[PDB]
Amino acid sequence: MSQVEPGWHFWLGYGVDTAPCNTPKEKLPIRAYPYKFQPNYTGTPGAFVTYNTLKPKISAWEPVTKQ
Amino acid sequence: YNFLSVRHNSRIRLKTYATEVTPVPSITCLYEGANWFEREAYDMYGVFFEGHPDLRRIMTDYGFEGHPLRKDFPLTGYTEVRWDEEKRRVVYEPLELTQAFRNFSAGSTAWEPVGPGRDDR
Amino acid sequence: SVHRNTENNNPSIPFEFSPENMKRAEEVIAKYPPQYKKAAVMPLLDIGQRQLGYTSISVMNYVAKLLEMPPMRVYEVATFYTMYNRTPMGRYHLQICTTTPCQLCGSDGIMEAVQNTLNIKPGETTKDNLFTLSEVECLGACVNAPMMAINDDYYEDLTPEGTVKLLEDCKAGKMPTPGPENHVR
Amino acid sequence: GEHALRRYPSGEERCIACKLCEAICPALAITIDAEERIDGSRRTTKYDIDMTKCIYCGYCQESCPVDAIVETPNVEYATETREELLYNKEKLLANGDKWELELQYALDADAPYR
Amino acid sequence: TNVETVAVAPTILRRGGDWFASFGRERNSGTKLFCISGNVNEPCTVEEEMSIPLRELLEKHCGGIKGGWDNLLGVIPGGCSVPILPKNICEDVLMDFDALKDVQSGLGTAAVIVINKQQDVIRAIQRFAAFYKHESCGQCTPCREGTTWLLKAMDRFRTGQAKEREIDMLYELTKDIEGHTICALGDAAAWPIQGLIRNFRPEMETRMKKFHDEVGAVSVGGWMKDARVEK
Amino acid sequence: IPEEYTKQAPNRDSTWAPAQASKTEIYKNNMVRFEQKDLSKQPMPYAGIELIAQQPVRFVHGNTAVCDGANHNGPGAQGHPKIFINVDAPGSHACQYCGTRYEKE
Amino acid sequence: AVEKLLNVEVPLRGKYIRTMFGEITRVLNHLMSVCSHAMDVGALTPFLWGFEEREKLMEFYERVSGARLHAAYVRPGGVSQDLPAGLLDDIYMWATQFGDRLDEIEELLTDNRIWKLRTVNIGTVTAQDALNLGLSGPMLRGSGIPFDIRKNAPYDAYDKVDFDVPVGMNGDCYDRYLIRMAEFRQSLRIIEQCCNDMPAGAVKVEDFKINSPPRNLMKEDMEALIHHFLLYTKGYSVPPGETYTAIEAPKGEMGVYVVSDGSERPYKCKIRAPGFAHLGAFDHIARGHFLPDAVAIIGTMDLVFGEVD
Amino acid sequence: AEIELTIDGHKVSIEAGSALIQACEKAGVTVPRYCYHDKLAIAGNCRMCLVDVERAPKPVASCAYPVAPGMVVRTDTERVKQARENVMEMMLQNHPLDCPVCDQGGECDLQDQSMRYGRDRGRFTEITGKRSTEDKNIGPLVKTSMNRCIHCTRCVRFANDIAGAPELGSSGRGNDMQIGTYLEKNLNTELSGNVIDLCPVGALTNKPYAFRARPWELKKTESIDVMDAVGSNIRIDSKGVEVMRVIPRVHEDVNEEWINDKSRFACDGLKTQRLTTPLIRVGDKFVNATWDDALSTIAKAYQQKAPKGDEFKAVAGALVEVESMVALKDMTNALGSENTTTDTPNGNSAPAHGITFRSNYLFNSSIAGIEDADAILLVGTNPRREAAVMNARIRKAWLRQELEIASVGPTLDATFDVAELGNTHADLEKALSGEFGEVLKNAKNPLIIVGSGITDREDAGAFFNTIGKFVESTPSVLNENWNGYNVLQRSASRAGAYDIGFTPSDEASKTTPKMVWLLGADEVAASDIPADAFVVYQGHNGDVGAQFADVVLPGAAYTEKAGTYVNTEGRSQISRAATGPPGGAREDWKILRAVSEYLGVALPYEDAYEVRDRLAEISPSLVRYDLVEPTVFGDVAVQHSLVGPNGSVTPSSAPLTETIENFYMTDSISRSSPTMAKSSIAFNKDNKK
Amino acid sequence: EIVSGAPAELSRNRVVRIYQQAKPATQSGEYGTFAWRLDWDIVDVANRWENDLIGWQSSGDYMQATQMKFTSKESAIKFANKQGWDFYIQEPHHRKFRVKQYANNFVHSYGKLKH
Numbered sequence A: 001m002s003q004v005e006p007g008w009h010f011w012l013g014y015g016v017d018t019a020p021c022n023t024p025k026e027k028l029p030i031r032a033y034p035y036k037f038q039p040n041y042t043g044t045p046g047a048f049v050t051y052n053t054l055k056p057k058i059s060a061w062e063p064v065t066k067q
Numbered sequence B: 001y002n003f004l005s006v007r008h009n010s011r012i013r014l015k016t017y018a019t020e021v022t023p024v025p026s027i028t029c030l031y032e033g034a035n036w037f038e039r040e041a042y043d044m045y046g047v048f049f050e051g052h053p054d055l056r057r058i059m060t061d062y063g064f065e066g067h068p069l070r071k072d073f074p075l076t077g078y079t080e081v082r083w084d085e086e087k088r089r090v091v092y093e094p095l096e097l098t099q100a101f102r103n104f105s106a107g108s109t110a111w112e113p114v115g116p117g118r119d120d121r
Numbered sequence C: 001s002v003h004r005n006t007e008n009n010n011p012s013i014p015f016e017f018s019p020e021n022m023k024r025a026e027e028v029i030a031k032y033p034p035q036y037k038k039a040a041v042m043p044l045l046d047i048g049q050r051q052l053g054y055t056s057i058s059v060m061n062y063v064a065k066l067l068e069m070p071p072m073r074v075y076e077v078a079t080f081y082t083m084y085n086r087t088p089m090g091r092y093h094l095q096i097c098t099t100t101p102c103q104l105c106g107s108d109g110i111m112e113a114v115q116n117t118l119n120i121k122p123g124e125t126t127k128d129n130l131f132t133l134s135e136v137e138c139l140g141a142c143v144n145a146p147m148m149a150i151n152d153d154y155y156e157d158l159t160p161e162g163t164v165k166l167l168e169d170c171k172a173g174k175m176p177t178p179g180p181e182n183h184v185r
Numbered sequence D: 001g002e003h004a005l006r007r008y009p010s011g012e013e014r015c016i017a018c019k020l021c022e023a024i025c026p027a028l029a030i031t032i033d034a035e036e037r038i039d040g041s042r043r044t045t046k047y048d049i050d051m052t053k054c055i056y057c058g059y060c061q062e063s064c065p066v067d068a069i070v071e072t073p074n075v076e077y078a079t080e081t082r083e084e085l086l087y088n089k090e091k092l093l094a095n096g097d098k099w100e101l102e103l104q105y106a107l108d109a110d111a112p113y114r
Numbered sequence E: 001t002n003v004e005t006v007a008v009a010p011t012i013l014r015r016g017g018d019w020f021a022s023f024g025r026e027r028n029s030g031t032k033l034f035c036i037s038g039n040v041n042e043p044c045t046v047e048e049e050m051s052i053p054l055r056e057l058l059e060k061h062c063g064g065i066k067g068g069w070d071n072l073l074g075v076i077p078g079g080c081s082v083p084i085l086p087k088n089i090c091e092d093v094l095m096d097f098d099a100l101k102d103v104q105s106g107l108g109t110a111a112v113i114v115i116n117k118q119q120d121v122i123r124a125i126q127r128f129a130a131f132y133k134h135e136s137c138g139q140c141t142p143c144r145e146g147t148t149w150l151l152k153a154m155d156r157f158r159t160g161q162a163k164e165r166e167i168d169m170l171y172e173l174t175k176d177i178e179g180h181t182i183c184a185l186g187d188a189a190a191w192p193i194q195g196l197i198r199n200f201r202p203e204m205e206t207r208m209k210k211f212h213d214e215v216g217a218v219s220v221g222g223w224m225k226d227a228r229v230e231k
Numbered sequence F: 001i002p003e004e005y006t007k008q009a010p011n012r013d014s015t016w017a018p019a020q021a022s023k024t025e026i027y028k029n030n031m032v033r034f035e036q037k038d039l040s041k042q043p044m045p046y047a048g049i050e051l052i053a054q055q056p057v058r059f060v061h062g063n064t065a066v067c068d069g070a071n072h073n074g075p076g077a078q079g080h081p082k083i084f085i086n087v088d089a090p091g092s093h094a095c096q097y098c099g100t101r102y103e104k105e
Numbered sequence G: 001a002v003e004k005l006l007n008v009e010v011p012l013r014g015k016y017i018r019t020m021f022g023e024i025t026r027v028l029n030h031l032m033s034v035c036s037h038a039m040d041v042g043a044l045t046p047f048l049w050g051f052e053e054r055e056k057l058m059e060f061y062e063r064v065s066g067a068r069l070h071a072a073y074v075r076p077g078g079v080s081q082d083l084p085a086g087l088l089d090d091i092y093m094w095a096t097q098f099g100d101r102l103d104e105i106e107e108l109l110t111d112n113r114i115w116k117l118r119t120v121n122i123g124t125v126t127a128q129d130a131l132n133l134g135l136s137g138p139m140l141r142g143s144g145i146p147f148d149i150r151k152n153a154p155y156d157a158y159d160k161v162d163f164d165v166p167v168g169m170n171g172d173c174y175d176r177y178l179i180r181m182a183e184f185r186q187s188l189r190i191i192e193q194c195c196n197d198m199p200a201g202a203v204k205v206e207d208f209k210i211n212s213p214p215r216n217l218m219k220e221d222m223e224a225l226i227h228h229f230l231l232y233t234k235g236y237s238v239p240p241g242e243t244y245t246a247i248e249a250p251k252g253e254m255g256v257y258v259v260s261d262g263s264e265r266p267y268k269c270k271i272r273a274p275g276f277a278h279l280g281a282f283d284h285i286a287r288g289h290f291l292p293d294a295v296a297i298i299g300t301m302d303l304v305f306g307e308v309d
Numbered sequence H: 001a002e003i004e005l006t007i008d009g010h011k012v013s014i015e016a017g018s019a020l021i022q023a024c025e026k027a028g029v030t031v032p033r034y035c036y037h038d039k040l041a042i043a044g045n046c047r048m049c050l051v052d053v054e055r056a057p058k059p060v061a062s063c064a065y066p067v068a069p070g071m072v073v074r075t076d077t078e079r080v081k082q083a084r085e086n087v088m089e090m091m092l093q094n095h096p097l098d099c100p101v102c103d104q105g106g107e108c109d110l111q112d113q114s115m116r117y118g119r120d121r122g123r124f125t126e127i128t129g130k131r132s133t134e135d136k137n138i139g140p141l142v143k144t145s146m147n148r149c150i151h152c153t154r155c156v157r158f159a160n161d162i163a164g165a166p167e168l169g170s171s172g173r174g175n176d177m178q179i180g181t182y183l184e185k186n187l188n189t190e191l192s193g194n195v196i197d198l199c200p201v202g203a204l205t206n207k208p209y210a211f212r213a214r215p216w217e218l219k220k221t222e223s224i225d226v227m228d229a230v231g232s233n234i235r236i237d238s239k240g241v242e243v244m245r246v247i248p249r250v251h252e253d254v255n256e257e258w259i260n261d262k263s264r265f266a267c268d269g270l271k272t273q274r275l276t277t278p279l280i281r282v283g284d285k286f287v288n289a290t291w292d293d294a295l296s297t298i299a300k301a302y303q304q305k306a307p308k309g310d311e312f313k314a315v316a317g318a319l320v321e322v323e324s325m326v327a328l329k330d331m332t333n334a335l336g337s338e339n340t341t342t343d344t345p346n347g348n349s350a351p352a353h354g355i356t357f358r359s360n361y362l363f364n365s366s367i368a369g370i371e372d373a374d375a376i377l378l379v380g381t382n383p384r385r386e387a388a389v390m391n392a393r394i395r396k397a398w399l400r401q402e403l404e405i406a407s408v409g410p411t412l413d414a415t416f417d418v419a420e421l422g423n424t425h426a427d428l429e430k431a432l433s434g435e436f437g438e439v440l441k442n443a444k445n446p447l448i449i450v451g452s453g454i455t456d457r458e459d460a461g462a463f464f465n466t467i468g469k470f471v472e473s474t475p476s477v478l479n480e481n482w483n484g485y486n487v488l489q490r491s492a493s494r495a496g497a498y499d500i501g502f503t504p505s506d507e508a509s510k511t512t513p514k515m516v517w518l519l520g521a522d523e524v525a526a527s528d529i530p531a532d533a534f535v536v537y538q539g540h541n542g543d544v545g546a547q548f549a550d551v552v553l554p555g556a557a558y559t560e561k562a563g564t565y566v567n568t569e570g571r572s573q574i575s576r577a578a579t580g581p582p583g584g585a586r587e588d589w590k591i592l593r594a595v596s597e598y599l600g601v602a603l604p605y606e607d608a609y610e611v612r613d614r615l616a617e618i619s620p621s622l623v624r625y626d627l628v629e630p631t632v633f634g635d636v637a638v639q640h641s642l643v644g645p646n647g648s649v650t651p652s653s654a655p656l657t658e659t660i661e662n663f664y665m666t667d668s669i670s671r672s673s674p675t676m677a678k679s680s681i682a683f684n685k686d687n688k689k
Numbered sequence I: 001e002i003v004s005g006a007p008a009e010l011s012r013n014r015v016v017r018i019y020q021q022a023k024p025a026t027q028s029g030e031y032g033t034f035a036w037r038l039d040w041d042i043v044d045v046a047n048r049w050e051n052d053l054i055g056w057q058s059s060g061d062y063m064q065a066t067q068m069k070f071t072s073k074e075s076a077i078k079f080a081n082k083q084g085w086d087f088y089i090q091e092p093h094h095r096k097f098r099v100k101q102y103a104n105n106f107v108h109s110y111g112k113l114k115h
């Protein structure tokens, strides 16, 4: 699974009577413009990993010496 | 104690007060449905009982001291970890250091309600 | 929509008052006890208003400095009063009463006649800067309800014909008029 | 499903870190941090779902007022590490970017009942 | 002190106390001034007896009603802030305080506004709503949001966007402002609408009859759509 | 803490950081475990900082701008709740739920 | 237990849908109990045939809940959300065939000589003892006391529905079989009449101080937002004091004993489980048997140990 | 002076002519309120505290209906409840929908007290719009969204009455009331940031806190203030490592409701440049190193130099704890000598009032009794620049009572009408003998408040003996039941430093230092350095002192420890930690005990209670908390503060300079925050008019 | 005294805090006034560090977040000595009576004027 582009995933799970290549006004919110669709990468070397987004919370001082 | 009638379809409640120090007697002398429940009471609290056969633990680990439903020790417990690598298969505890602590709920509004009382008299 | 807007558009604290105004102001302040001394602030703002039309932030700051006041209390006074016009205003402020008796005797058509004469939305001014419209509520004078006021005084009992004659006249020729006739009965 | 973050049409990352989806996650599997971003509005600095401990009660979906965290219908899972389960902000925004078609079908059959 | 209650003071200290007590009621007394305006035959001003028939007042001293006695629709007695008497229980009531207080109308200004039957009471009361919007001060929390909400409602009632229950909703929200201010300006704003639900509602429903689908199907794309109130 | 790099990714479609304290360096982000991995794990956020510059400014000649964000195909209410914003000074064109810019004209 | 402690009452739509969901849940619980029982006894076909329409009941959860079997669907303030239309249309067509297939699984166990010596007067529990043991529910009514809660302390519209309760005569495991097999075809009547009598109304509680606002006008209103906000931050106000509430879950009398502080969070909650009492009675029942007796007598008294603590 | 009134069976006696809300709150009856406040004047604006009173047609506003004797008062008539719902509806149907993104999520007091008094259907249609409100800039320190202002007018009354910056005026009528100014000018006043804890809706809010947290994540923790000698009444909001914001807790004697505005923004001064690890210099090349390495380097350098007698000049830093200073003094005296001075510019000498007779030292009048003082005068200080909440009580008294107030020394604009009488000591003695010799003797319980800045100068002599001799020489009021002679300190810990008795002893002060213990001493560090420096800088947030250091010790700050502090009135106030210290960063007195191990003269005490036991053995006023009465030495202390420094210093006529130029950048925490840098550059034409 | 059911060595090691919860200054409303709180301090090396993988705050205190809610301070302290660990009590702080004439809007000869 996950080779299915997930708009069709209802139509393989009976989430809709109508096939998803019918109505254009329901189907188009997309202007988040690329749609690359990585299926799943588990066990593949390029698996998803995770990380803190931000920075450390405390921000250690920078070693600047005066005279 | 919550009790249930059969002829009368009527519940009742009966309360005592007991200290961790001093016991109160059980009610297993009257019927046989008690001796499991009072084990549960002893395990969750350390409310120690009296006049009772098989006051064991059911509801915790067998080497686990403490008593959980006392509001003394929190959700994590004292020793709750388990790992088994070097001293092989000896899944022995440690100081339970969680991975994210139970960040609590410490908010409270003005005041809930004042009760509209009702009694027969 | 009585607004409390910025102070950027070329009104940035540069003005004063004039010679007889200070004497007249001292005369006004003398009607009030020496300590506990603010209450001349509203007629002093009138004196500033008649000295400088469209009472700016500058003359208000000058008054606040003059009567020993912190300025925001003076702003808090002149934020209320619709007399204290802020935006630049033409030679003849035209205040049409559109309250209930004025409504019921036809000031609605009077405002229609004015906007036919002067194509101005009723909160704006003429591009000639001769007139500035303002719908206004009841000036008390429900005597002859199609009246309006113009910048000082009341013109009772206006037909749209008399109204457009007044708009022609008050371009140049003054009309010291209560109404077309004399009396109130 | 798997917690995909929606965005608007031409979406400015519809989650506002409003913390309502924090305060009801019954296993505390939500960890958020927020900040005033550069353009003035408030956004999520980090957004954290313990998919170890997400019971899938959907209360996150039942309370995020701008309807920005959404249970998916996709069962697309089975990672080999916990480190491949701890969803940060990028995974959830990516997951919403992978499908909103299915989510649009879901909401347009559900949002007059929610 | 009012300017009129102090204007009578030197005349009433030069005349006797029985001079002013000779008139009106056993508790109401003397003469008071009347400013009679609105859609009448001759708009005018007099200073006359209290406790007079309002019909004699209109017919003997100000011409009468423009259209005659069978062409009013309501009368605003006393203040601007007084309920409107209907055409039948304006005929024979009085022009005092206390008996008209018993007909719900506190004539605290004694300034009578009379309307033709060919004109909108709705526009009059809507104009009073805009009046109190210009004249609410700001200290009272209920007075401001009150007058704003009342204006928003009376625009709907002019245009006929309301629903039949919204009349009573309006009456309830007027009752919300009935005793809950600092000064009586909010009460003064509450009087005309409480006078509107009294004696009326054929015409609220008649204006609301003039289209269907109240609270209409609209979208609000960037501004609102499909209808609007005043701007 | 040492010398190693893999030049294959900036922050997002936007080049620099998205906000205060949201870094994009990888060494502080524990470069120990990015190895043997595609870099085609998901950098999919397009950084909505860029997507307001995508968005055009909307004009309203009134004084109060309503914002919903809700679609005109959804049967249920889906946009952010009805915030009324002011267009009074130029600059304050910011619906704090959507970032759509409302200017008075 | 909570809405008793709130002095509120869920409207009639909510009571009927919780009652019909309680009875499809009863069908599910007795079905899985009899199936796991018979699998421990040894027959594999009743297990799988019963799970075949347990999957349909899983869907009937799924078209309401967010998952297959667990659900946050009931609330203290009623329920989460009203039903979808095709569900209520389909559930009639399900209940059309479920009686036939319940007969189909019934024909090869109830009649055979196996289950007639595999279940004999085995684990006989007299009523004098069963009352003294803290037993309840199916074993109690198998010991011949015509008492449950539902006909006798009617919570949530079981008052309003024709509901007949089976009564044992012999306190063995065979009547504990047949009383469940009767409760199936008593619960199906409930699903019938709750399909018929389904009113129209508010399915949450009527006010919005206590459960959840409706998600439509939570985005067009001040007050709906503040109620939404506080209902998902601070929970909500609960008046102080104690209560206890027991209903007959299909494993027996479940009791919930809640001491509420008067605050956002319950100061004490104690569950009470038939799977913790029947398990307690097990030693007094099991004596004088063999081990393959004991395997069956586990499954009779509904010993699913996720209801121990 | 007492009156019984009955609120709903609860009879209760309170003082005559008082507030009915005060009767309700004394009677334990919760009354909802929005524009009432305790320490502000009453406005009738919010209209929520309606209560039914017999012999009254309307439910009156309990905030302002005065106490009539023997009233029957009902808070539970259905008119009251089903009018409160009415008023809450008519407060909410012009409020915006900011509740998820308004900052006061679990603290919008409107929202908090809405559910238990409110009504669901705020009646609207898509046709109807509410109103919009223009956002306004009050300053880069306060974020402002005036759309939410429910016109509680608590802000206006606060900026007028307590703050004294009247620049936040009201404007407009109807819907169009806006609060602030329509000049669009920034408020730049002291204690401005109290207002964001004061506007009960989230219309005003904190700018660096802006959206970081939301109050149920927050381990709200009791602690004691720093960066002011008053020891204010703070409470720390903590997320667990980071510190989110602070809230002034209530403490009725000391600064009952307020914070110094510098103290509000230590959070942005905390998590920015802390010392997380010990740092050592190779020399202009400044590397971090192992803890034990740095300790052995310090001990080895001590053995290299051998500064045995009258040397190793430790110095009291600005912002430390008493327990670290006890470890400092005890370690120095154990090592062999005593040389501990403070940060002050050439206060390497006694403060010209002895450490004997504690009452001579600190602000020995009560802070509440300031509003019991008839007329006071201030010398050598600008109490707006230092201890701004002391200035708040000054203005509270000055509006309450009749006070003759004069400044002598620095030229100050403070909002209570001083009369400045010179910039010279001769002007001081002239003004004392001239007309305040009449006033203070004639007045009833006067006070005389002196800055710490004069103690910095070499003019701690005749300038200070003049006022002490005047205290003795006008003995009629200032002796028995009152003590007017008072000083303030800049930093908090200098009070406890002079309590433990750091000695500037002239047998040791006339030598050169060769080892230096800096404890945050940013001020003095430019001057007091030899070539053989070996500067040991212990503390945090290495702005100045770490830049002059030889070995950095990452000390934990006030947030991370139970720092027992002394106010400027002698009260001991104990803290609690609200987070652990970041990084290595061990606790300070433990650091000095370990130095006593390596620099091998160990202390006699190492556990937690042992420190308090020795502290009790040193000065037992510091182990009994927040209750001081120094009545025993009110008279001998001025003799022993006068005769000692008498005439040793000729009175120099150098003018009394301003003690603090930049209030916003001080103390090596507020010195180092991007909040205080922004507020420090908020001085410009925007502020001026 | 030996502890009967406290498996930690809490009873010899930590300082606990009995405190009245402070009156919050932001909201008005005073429900936190009517409790008594037991709280263990964080005077620790454990003391909530920072995680390195996701960046939660994994603590080391097994009893970091724990609050009793008692009724009376002396009942609190009798419990605190009964289960027997080292405490510190903290006295609350009230708000003092001040007579508030709403009529405080009147003067003699005096410079300063207010709203």
Ligand SMILES: Cc1cc2nc3c(=O)[nH]c(=O)nc-3n(C[C@H](O)[C@H](O)[C@H](O)COP(=O)(O)O)c2cc1C
Residues within 6 Å of the ligand: E001, E002, E003, E005, E183, E184, E185, E188
């Ligand atoms: C909102 C409000 C507005 C009022 N406006 C006026 C007015 O415009 N002219 C007037 O003479 N009285 C007005 N009054 C009545 C005054 O209170 C009046 O001075 C008062 O009744 C004095 O009583 P008197 O008639 O005995 O002098 C108003 C009262 C209220 C509550």
Ligand code: SF4
Residues within 6 Å of the ligand: D024, D025, D026, D027, D028, D029, D030, D049, D053, D054, D055, D056, D057, D058, D059, D060, D061
């Ligand atoms: S679905 Fe449930 S468990 Fe998961 S994050 Fe949302 S509320 Fe928490």
Ligand code: SF4
Residues within 6 Å of the ligand: D014, D015, D016, D017, D018, D019, D020, D021, D022, D032, D060, D063, D064, D065, D066, D067, D068, D069, H100
């Ligand atoms: S509920 Fe919404 S606003 Fe709140 S954290 Fe979740 S996505 Fe963000």
Ligand code: SF4
Residues within 6 Å of the ligand: E135, E136, E137, E138, E139, E140, E141, E143, E144, E181, E182, E183, E184, E185, E186, E187
């Ligand atoms: S009733 Fe009076 S005090 Fe109240 S808001 Fe209106 S004008 Fe102001």
Ligand code: SF4
Residues within 6 Å of the ligand: G226, H095, H096, H097, H098, H099, H100, H102, H103, H104, H105, H107, H108, H109, H110, H111, H148, H200, H201, H202, H203
């Ligand atoms: S003040 Fe802000 S958080 Fe509170 S109810 Fe209003 S919008 Fe919501």
Ligand code: SF4
Residues within 6 Å of the ligand: H148, H149, H150, H151, H152, H153, H154, H155, H156, H179, H198, H199, H200, H201, H203, H204
């Ligand atoms: S500034 Fe804040 S506290 Fe003051 S009136 Fe406005 S909303 Fe209320």
Ligand code: FES
Residues within 6 Å of the ligand: C097, C098, C099, C100, C101, C102, C137, C138, C139, C140, C141, C142, C143, C145
């Ligand atoms: S009627 Fe409008 S002015 Fe009197």
Ligand code: FES
Residues within 6 Å of the ligand: H033, H034, H035, H036, H037, H043, H044, H045, H046, H047, H048, H049, H050, H061, H062, H063, H064
């Ligand atoms: S303060 Fe009492 S009503 Fe506003």
Ligand SMILES: [Zn+2]
Residues within 6 Å of the ligand: F067, F068, F069, F080, F095, F096, F097, F098, F099, F100
């Ligand atoms: Zn928006």
